[PDB]
């Protein structure tokens, strides 16, 4: 069985494309101005600019994930292997899920650029400056630095076509299921709203949807939205997920 | 100085899951079965059983967290809270309670439940008040509620479909009665109530004629969950910058 899910709430959504203008001042000192803003953002090799295209989750986004994980704990769902997209937001999410499972120390996360979302969405001709696992583990994030990626950064393409994405996802997935096959029977993926229809489209075996009813079906996926597949029967299908959803509204006004 | 802090309760069960939420988290024999991770681990039993919840519903999980955070935040600022009262709505007592829990003062501050801080009653459904849990019952639920507090406006003395002018007037008399009963016993006061409260309790406290009702309601709608204002004595009182930061997040989406 397989579990894919979307990341916590984003700081660049709640607070705007001009959000660094509300954290940071002249000398690049972080200054929180809302309570949903972390108390420290971690320091980045490149400097504060790497956020602009690689934003971290908000306080409530963490909680979203720490709750999902606690829920996994309560439902006696043992998670054997967890892989996440190199997006900062997808790493911070995954680390909190594990806190909730109380496995921040035991489990160690496979980072995998193959899980990232359709680069059509990236601004400009350039990818976000992802933190390399050595530097993520560096900020006290239970990450597995050893894990060699199955689709390296460099091997990815900088504003790709629709069916390049669906194939690299339904390609990366097929690899990850083989990777574990009898090293634990429960793998989770922390990734993106696009990830859920792209990776389990072909796993369950369906015929990918037009580039118009993907975007259709994707924007309808909440934060920490999350889905279950179950099969060596070679026949994978969706199962009612082992936990309940997490619907709240906004702060209001 | 002397200060009066008025803030609005947290996230409402019956806003995130609708007028018919009870139909979602309660089955036929009457067992509470939570269907969403934003619903609490369990609900406190009422004198009327559960149907008592549909006119006095409680805060959600993220509502609790919203108010645990305000309490964390006041305490981080070395803002000392000398006096907590609150509306008899469950949503406000529970919000009040988590504030104490993030202030690290559940075991020293006792919430003065005061029915005259209930919202304008033209907002109550039908023609009977909501079946508020009495202080003693709240103290019986680990809720740090002062059960000897003698109210200034008792429940029997609250009118039904009352007038805007009534309400502005009881909100003014209550606020002057709370302040005076605290004039020597301590420095800073926290009212936990409704969006209506933040205007209704403070407009005349600062020397002002009160807004017309249509404009009163336009202000009131702009107040978010845990919105939080602030008043300071010059016997006239002035609004001021809160001692803590605002708090914004959005839906789950
Ligand atoms: C499902 C029942 C349910 C849910 C939410 C609410 C809600 O949103 N209540 C407001 C106050 C208010 C109440 C009203 O019945 N009518 C209004 C009209 C204008 C402005 C405020 C109100 C608040 O919580 O402050 C009112 C009932």
């Amino acid at each position: 069985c397989l579990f894919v899910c979307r990341h916590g709430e984003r700081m660049d959504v709640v607070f705007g494309k001009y959000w660094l203008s509300q954290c940071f001042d002249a000398k690049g000192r972080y200054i929180r101005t809302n309570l949903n803003m972390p108390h420290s953002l971690p320091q980045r090799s490149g400097g504060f600019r790497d956020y602009e295209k690689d934003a971290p989750i908000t306080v409530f986004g963490c909680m979203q994930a720490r709750l999902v994980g606690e829920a996994l704990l309560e439902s006696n769902t043992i998670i054997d292997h967890v892989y996440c997209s190199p997006s900062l937001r997808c790493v911070q999410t995954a680390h909190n899920i594990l806190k909730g499972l109380q496995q921040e120390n035991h489990l160690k996360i496979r980072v995998e650029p193959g899980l990232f979302e359709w680069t059509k969405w990236v601004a400009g001709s350039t990818l976000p400056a992802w933190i390399p696992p050595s530097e993520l583990a560096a900020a006290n994030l239970s990450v597995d630095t050893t894990y060699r990626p199955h689709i390296p950064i460099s091997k990815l393409v900088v504003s790709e076509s629709y069916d390049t994405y669906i194939s690299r996802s339904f390609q990366v997935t097929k690899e990850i299921i083989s990777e574990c096959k009898s090293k634990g029977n429960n793998i989770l993926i922390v990734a993106h709203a696009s990830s859920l229809e792209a990776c389990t489209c072909q796993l369950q075996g369906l015929s990918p949807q037009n580039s118009k009813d993907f975007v259709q079906m994707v924007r309808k996926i909440p934060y920490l939205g999350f889905c279950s597949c179950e099969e060596e029967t070679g026949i994978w299908q969706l199962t009612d997920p082992p936990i309940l959803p997490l619907t709240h509204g906004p702060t209001g006004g």
Side-chain angles (χ1 to χ4, degrees), chain A residues 1-16 19-20 22-44 46-51 54-65 68-75 77 79-82 84-103 106-107 109-119 121-124 126-134 136-141 143-147 149 151-154 157 160-163 165-166 168-170 172-173 176-178 180 184 186 189-193 195-196 198-201 203 205-208 210 213-215 218 221-227 229 231 234 236 238-239 241-253:
Chain A
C1 176
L2 192 79
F3 298 144
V4 173
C5 83
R6 164 161 180 227
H7 60 90
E9 167 188 73
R10 288 166 64 162
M11 245 174 87
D12 56 309
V13 181
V14 166
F15 290 108
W19 66 270
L20 298 150
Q22 312 175 20
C23 299
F24 293 93
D25 69 357
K27 276 142 183 85
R29 299 179 295 201
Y30 185 64
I31 298 173
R32 79 201 286 259
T33 48
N34 203 273
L35 295 175
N36 199 21
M37 292 203 235
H39 164 94
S40 72
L41 288 185
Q43 262 192 350
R44 297 191 71 146
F48 86 99
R49 281 296 157 198
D50 296 338
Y51 286 132
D54 188 30
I57 49 167
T58 74
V59 175
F60 274 54
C62 280
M63 284 176 188
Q64 301 178 342
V68 181
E70 263 147 22
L72 284 159
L73 197 159
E74 274 185 32
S75 56
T77 285
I79 302 316
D80 302 300
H81 292 137
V82 53
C84 73
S85 158
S87 307
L88 177 46
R89 68 191 167 278
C90 307
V91 173
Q92 279 169 335
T93 296
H95 179 38
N96 286 110
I97 291 90
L98 293 172
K99 287 202 154 137
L101 308 170
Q102 291 170 7
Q103 301 211 288
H106 178 27
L107 283 151
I109 304 167
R110 284 102 166 104
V111 183
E112 177 61 333
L115 302 160
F116 194 67
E117 51 174 24
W118 194 24
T119 46
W121 290 321
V122 191
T126 172
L127 291 187
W130 293 327
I131 306 185
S134 94
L136 284 162
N140 191 52
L141 279 64
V143 175
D144 181 37
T145 70
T146 81
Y147 166 86
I151 290 299
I153 308 88
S154 280
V157 287
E160 65 204 78
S161 65
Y162 176 99
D163 37 322
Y165 172 51
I166 285 295
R168 73 151 155 103
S169 297
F170 166 40
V172 62
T173 293
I176 321 184
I177 288 188
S178 285
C180 313
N186 284 323
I189 301 188
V190 189
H192 283 280
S195 313
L196 287 63
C199 305
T200 52
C201 179
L203 201 54
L206 283 302
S207 313
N210 48 338
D213 291 308
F214 193 82
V215 161
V218 309
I221 304 295
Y223 293 133
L224 269 297
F226 154 43
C227 83
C229 278
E231 66 161 345
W236 278 89
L238 299 166
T239 44
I243 54 188
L244 311 157
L246 167 57
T247 310
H248 64 84
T251 198

